[PDB]
From a paper:
Abscisic acid (ABA) is a phytohormone essential to the regulation of numerous aspects of plant growth and development. ABCG25 in Arabidopsis thaliana has been identified to be an ABA exporter and play roles in regulating stomatal closure and seed germination. As a ‘half-transporter’ with only one NBD and one transmembrane domain (TMD) in a polypeptide chain, ABCG25 forms a homodimer as a functional unit, similar to other determined ‘half-transporter’ ABCG structures including the human cholesterol transporter ABCG1 (hABCG1) and multidrug transporter ABCG2 (hABCG2)39–47. In this study, we determined the high-resolution structures of ABCG25 in Arabidopsis thaliana in the apo, ABA-bound and ATP-bound states using cryogenic electron microscopy (cryo-EM) single particle analysis.
We generated a catalytic mutant by replacing the glutamate residue E232 in the conserved Walker B motif of the nucleotide-binding domain (NBD) with a glutamine (named ABCG25EQ hereafter). An EM map with an overall resolution of 3.0 Å was finally obtained. Clear densities were observed in each NBD, fitting well with the ATP molecule and Mg2+. ATP forms intense interactions with residues from both NBDs, thus pulling NBDs close together. ATP binding leads to closure of the NBDs and such large movements are transduced to the TMDs through the three-helix bundle formed by CnH, CpH of the TMD and E-helix of the NBD. The extracellular gate remains closed at this state, with Y564 and Y565 forming the plugging residues. Thus, the ATP-bound structure of ABCG25EQ may represent a state during the transport cycle when the bound ABA is released from the intracellular cavity when the extracellular gate is transiently open, and the extracellular gate closes again, ready to reset to the resting state after ATP hydrolysis and ADP release.
Numbering used by the authors:
A (entry chain A), B (entry chain C): 35 to 51, 80 to 325, 336 to 360, 379 to 606, 620 to 662
Write the structure that this text describes.
Amino acid sequence: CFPITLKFVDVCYRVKIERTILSGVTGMISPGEFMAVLGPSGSGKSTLLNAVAGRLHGSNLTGKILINDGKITKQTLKRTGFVAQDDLLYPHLTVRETLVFVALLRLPRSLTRDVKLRAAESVISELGLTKCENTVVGNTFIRGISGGERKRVSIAHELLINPSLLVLDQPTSGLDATAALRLVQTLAGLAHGKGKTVVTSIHQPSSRVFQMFDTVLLLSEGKCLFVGKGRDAMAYFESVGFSPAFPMNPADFLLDLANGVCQNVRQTLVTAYDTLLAPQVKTCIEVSITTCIATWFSQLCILLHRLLKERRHESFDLLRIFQVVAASILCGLMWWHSDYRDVHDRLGLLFFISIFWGVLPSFNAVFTFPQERAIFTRERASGMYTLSSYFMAHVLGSLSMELVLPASFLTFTYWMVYLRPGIVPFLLTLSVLLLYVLASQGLGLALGAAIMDAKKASTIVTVTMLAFVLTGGYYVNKVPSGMVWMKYVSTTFYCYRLLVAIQYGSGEEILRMLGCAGCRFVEEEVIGDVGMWTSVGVLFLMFFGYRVLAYLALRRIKH
Amino acid sequence: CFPITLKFVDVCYRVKIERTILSGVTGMISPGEFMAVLGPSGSGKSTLLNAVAGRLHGSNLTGKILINDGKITKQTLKRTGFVAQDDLLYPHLTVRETLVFVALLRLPRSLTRDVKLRAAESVISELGLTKCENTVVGNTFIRGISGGERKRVSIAHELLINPSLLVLDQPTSGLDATAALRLVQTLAGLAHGKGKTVVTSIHQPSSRVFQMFDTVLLLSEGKCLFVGKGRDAMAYFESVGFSPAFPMNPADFLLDLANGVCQNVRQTLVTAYDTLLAPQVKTCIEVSITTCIATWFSQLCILLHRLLKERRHESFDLLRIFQVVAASILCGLMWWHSDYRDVHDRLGLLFFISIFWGVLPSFNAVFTFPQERAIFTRERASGMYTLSSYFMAHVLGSLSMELVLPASFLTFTYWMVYLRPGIVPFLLTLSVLLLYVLASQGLGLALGAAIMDAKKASTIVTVTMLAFVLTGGYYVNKVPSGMVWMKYVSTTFYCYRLLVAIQYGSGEEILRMLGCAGCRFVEEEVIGDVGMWTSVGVLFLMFFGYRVLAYLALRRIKH
Ligand SMILES: Nc1ncnc2c1ncn2[C@@H]1O[C@H](COP(=O)(O)OP(=O)(O)OP(=O)(O)O)[C@@H](O)[C@H]1O
Ligand SMILES: Nc1ncnc2c1ncn2[C@@H]1O[C@H](COP(=O)(O)OP(=O)(O)OP(=O)(O)O)[C@@H](O)[C@H]1O
Ligand SMILES: [Mg+2]
Ligand SMILES: [Mg+2]
């Protein structure tokens, strides 16, 4: 156990459209207590819950928000559960597969599997989800579960973390009259039977749901009108002058007073709060090893299989492989019947392969992290997993299909053109082309993680790659000697220098075959200047270096 | 007036996970009548409302859904308003700007402006939106209006069309107890004061909201338990054997019977419905000029200014122009001090400009229609605007920034390299490069409209453009004569042939300057074979032809 006492004193919040959203909201909620935050629409009660959760800060917010007499630490955000108002889930897992991945990641690890699975399916039977558990969670384009079943998957998503402070933002909207009573009876058993601290906002409770709250907060356009016990609310407003004509729901009467339609009703109740109850609240706020490298790897295995079955359907594209294959038959027919002695044509084949496999991996990889932006952000604030195992699961998860496409391109082009016979110069050509595809993929990952949308990022990578083609070593013969150093930054340069070295070597065979346009051209472009091992040792430095800079760009995003 | 009588007889709906969602739902709602669809979560009442709206069809749905004794026609979907459960709005318009664009497009056109604007702001004062009207509607990443204010913008969005059948899917979820009473009192004034047909589903009504419905439908796992007047519901279930112990809300008692927790309750009430009330429902279902080209243009002007102020902020990028400018200084320095007589180097400059400005417009344009997919789909089913004025507003809206980038690229490169002096060969080079940018943009628009997401589509366009580079006319000298026809499909071919013709002409000056590698190379590649006017007349055929095929690919999407 780790009991949280929450305090918030004089919380204000301005925004620039200057509009005051919250102004002077003081309260305190203890462990063992279930509090409701009532109010009209726009009164500010999802800005107040979003500041005591720790997801709203800056120079707009002003006021002391205290969790056990201290600031909001990184330690206290691991014991806090926050169920937001909009639901962000994966559109391809089923309801049971969604709630097993949460149970394996977040439950105490010194606990056997098949007990973590009998915790995930005793939550399904408490929320009534045992009819749609084999149904896929959908989105706007994939039709799946209901809106009231999607709401209860998100509450189960936080009820499997076992929090110490549970903050919910309208959990009963979209639920009928019987499912909303049972959910409030569940949350009242956490507060009264386990000693937790539950804060919730709620819109249309019945007279039976309203009798289960220990404490009511009533907002009205950013200023509170009542803080105290729910069984004192109707007897407070009678002593100020307001009472219902016909007997009715007490939660219907308190929302007429907050709208001011209970027959200056609002401004009477604001200054009557600041002289009768507001001083006595701030008087009450004065006193009241090898088991560590197994948790990294098991988080990696869960995050792999979760992303392999996102791409199971909507993917396994034969369309990507039947188009790269037709482009390799197309290149192999343009250079059908070219000869080994024609050096000027063979170096234009080898430079087009460098253009093709620098442009194609790099432009595809710019979609990887921007297409995860809303769900990565939400799960980073929860504390689900570390970043170095989320990152490494996307490195290893892309690497299968990214290596089948260059290997099937080159099997057609190498033997139709009939470049150089032997199994040894074929496999060296295959492995240089697979090291260049991985170094070109990491350029697109780093620019998609720094710029977090794909339309803005796939403009920066198109101009950057066309500048690597220009300084890559084919287009200009004399460069101004003061711009010769720019080719040592280009990835395209080090691949094209390695493919020419496998085919023609260090001269010395074409120079005896071409005799010695025949012996002048083959001394600037065939002989070369960068060694064969330093062109390999720099494509490894761009392999690791472009994935380090993609990790540091994702490290920024925090809340 | 055009009164709609809605009927639906024996509606079934199966889905393949075989699961029966709806089975045998018979009802009839007349004009002047306000009907509520009650039920638990997952009982199927948003599948039933989504089939009588006309947005759900196929081989799964089976049953006669009739609107004035006929099928769902294209004419009846113009008089129908459907407020869905999730809200899809533009994240950059304010609340007032959202509701003025709807009033100008959808109100009767033979009606003066400043009366269409006093219709848009008398709806704001009926829904209580007169505090957030100057606040921007947000999204998940832009913080804007509330969730209960977003719900009422969507109801106002359909209350400005003046429908004849209004179908709403949970309109009071996210609203407090006083705003939910006023909204039901608004919808009851449309049905009883104007003679419309309102169908709504609703979750937790109070005892005062429940007394405003004329007709109740009660579902329970896809089978109806009661159809009839709301003031006969409690007296019906008493005569079968069910009655509340303590006096309570009648809408709370009917949801206990549908969940079966009212103390085989459900299966008793299903077979008691099919012998007592279900035969008497189907007995009742037996009887009961130049003003046309001004509406095209005013829809074009509203759709332009709506999309120009979506790109006002999040855009006006100096980042796109400061990077294209640096790439033009970079090209102009690589070919600084190259001479006019060196023909083999100048034709490698001119081919790199063809690569740069075919790849850059085409890859950016693949995001245009896929980033509008959810909102284009919703407004296409409403009948907001025609497609040929939505399409033409995106042609004219992109064309400003797409022509400033090639014109500022070429001002640096043409005079640093110092290609050919004269203002006349400069402007011919500028206009050929602007005709090729528009023809390359239309290739990306057609592949983004046919494939309706941008990650799948920006793989098809990368391999297609690298195949236009290969057959574009630089890489291979002898092609197998049986593949010479493929260059006449490439866009890159016709630009590169036009830039060589402006610089060197029809030979006849370099041949006297180079005397006659000097007179052999300049006869395959400088002389050329395609005329100067047929290279212009084919880039106009690919200009119009690639925007026709993008219109026909958007014509598919309908509901
Ligand atoms: N494409 C689908 N595949 C499988 N099941 C589906 C599909 N679409 C809907 N369902 C199921 O149909 C049932 C009814 O769904 P629907 O959304 O129509 O009910 P609802 O009454 O609107 O629920 P709520 O009140 O929670 O919004 C749900 O149990 C849902 O799981
Ligand atoms: N970034 C912002 N800029 C301008 N106004 C804002 C911003 N954020 C919130 N508001 C305004 O603050 C008011 C309160 O918003 P909030 O969402 O906190 O209220 P709420 O009680 O949760 O409403 P609901 O009950 O409808 O969900 C709203 O009127 C909203 O328009
Ligand atoms: Mg639903
Ligand atoms: Mg809100």
